[PDB]
């Protein structure tokens, strides 16, 4: 029974090792979009400062 439980524990710990690797890679993809998103707003902030510095269309 201990060997069967250890095999089940090893089998269960096998799925978690694949699950944790899968979640980390899936969150890397999700964080890539947020990083690309933040690049847009960072570029937008620079462009917004340009509108303020015009002093004629501002």
């Amino acid at each position: 029974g201990n060997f069967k439980s250890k095999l089940k524990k090893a089998m269960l710990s096998q799925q978690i090792t694949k699950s944790t690797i899968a979640n980390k890679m899936r969150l890397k993809v999700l964080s890539a979009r947020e990083q690309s998103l933040d690049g847009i707003f960072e570029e937008t902030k620079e462009k917004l400062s340009g509108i303020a510095n015009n002093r004629d269309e501002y």
Binding site: N2, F3, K6, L7, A10
Partner: protein
């Protein structure tokens, strides 16, 4: 009676033999536990190899 006292000693010797015979059964039971442990150890060793695999 002196002869009857010797017979009582023989009964005591038989009781001692019976106690020794009972002790032998207890000793066999103690040896039985050791034999079971050896069988369990072999299964434990096989289980350990499976865990290593």
């Amino acid at each position: 009676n002196g002869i009857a006292t010797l017979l009582q000693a023989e009964k005591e010797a038989h009781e001692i033999v019976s106690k020794a015979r009972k002790y032998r059964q207890d000793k066999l039971k103690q040896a039985k536990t050791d034999a079971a442990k050896e069988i369990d150890s072999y299964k434990i060793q096989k289980d350990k190899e499976l865990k290593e695999f």
